[PDB]
Amino acid sequence: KKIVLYSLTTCGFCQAIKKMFDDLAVGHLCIQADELTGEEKKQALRDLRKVNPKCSFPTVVIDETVVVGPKIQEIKEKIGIRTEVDELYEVLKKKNEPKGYYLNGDREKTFELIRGLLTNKKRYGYMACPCRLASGDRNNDRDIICPCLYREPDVKEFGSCYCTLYVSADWYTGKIERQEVAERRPPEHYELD
């Protein structure tokens, strides 16, 4: 697959697409159009205009298909990128949505939280809460294995769990204030002394 990424050093999403490519050892050509001369900029825009008439950044060309804008799932779909986070995202969505627990709509935040669940599943053997420190002992951590014991009262009182991974329909659609959620876990559960 021949990939070209039209990018700008000042464009945050352009750098995130580039980062994903580098991390997954994807073979691509990145054009940081703003680092070019006045005439090279004109030529980069003419090349871009042929595949994206709006001359907008980011734009990804994969062989003969073009993905315009911050459409990370569509870019992944044309390149053939499938990770265990994508798999777990689908599983969690199917299981939780009928229960009224929606995954946070900020996809980039939810994806890093799911990556945290996976990192915890590998090192501990269970999906310990990604925004808490686990002990590594399953029995001590039983109340913070996701979904934790605190999700139900936290979502009922504030509209979201402690990591903001699961949110209610009201939190999702802004019908309630998106309040900060305090740590409900009894501090004694660490068994420090």
Q: Where is 3: in which H helix or E strand?
A: strand 3-7
Task: Please identify, using beta-carbon distances, which residue of 86 and 152 lies nearer to ligand SF4.
Answer: 152
Q: How many residues does the chain have?
A: 193
Q: Is 30 annotated as a binding residue?
A: no
- Output the six-digit token pair for 96: 């939780």
Q: Is 144 exposed, middle or buried (0-12, 13-18, 19+ CB in 10 A)?
A: buried
- Output the six-digit token pair for 146: 């996701």
Least separation in angstroms between residue 156's CB and a copy of itself is: 18
Task: Please identify, using beta-carbon distances, which residue of 21 and 101 lies nearer to ligand SF4.
Answer: 101
Task: Please identify, using beta-carbon distances, which residue of 118 and 131 lies nearer to ligand SF4.
Answer: 131
Per-residue contact string for residues 71-110; x = within reach of a copy of itself by CB under 8 A = x---------------------------------xx--x-
Alpha carbons 34 and 163: distance in angstroms, whole number = 37
Task: Please identify, using beta-carbon distances, which residue of 147 and 159 lies nearer to ligand SF4.
Answer: 147
Q: Is 56 near a copy of itself (CB under 8 A)?
A: yes
User: Could you tell me which residues come within 8 angstroms of residue 144 by beta carbon, excluding any fewer than 6 positions away?
Assistant: 128, 129, 132, 134, 150, 185
- Binding residues for ligand SF4, per CB under 6 A? 129-131, 144, 146-148, 150-151, 161-163, 165-166
Annotated binding site for [4Fe-4S] cluster: 129, 146, 148, 161
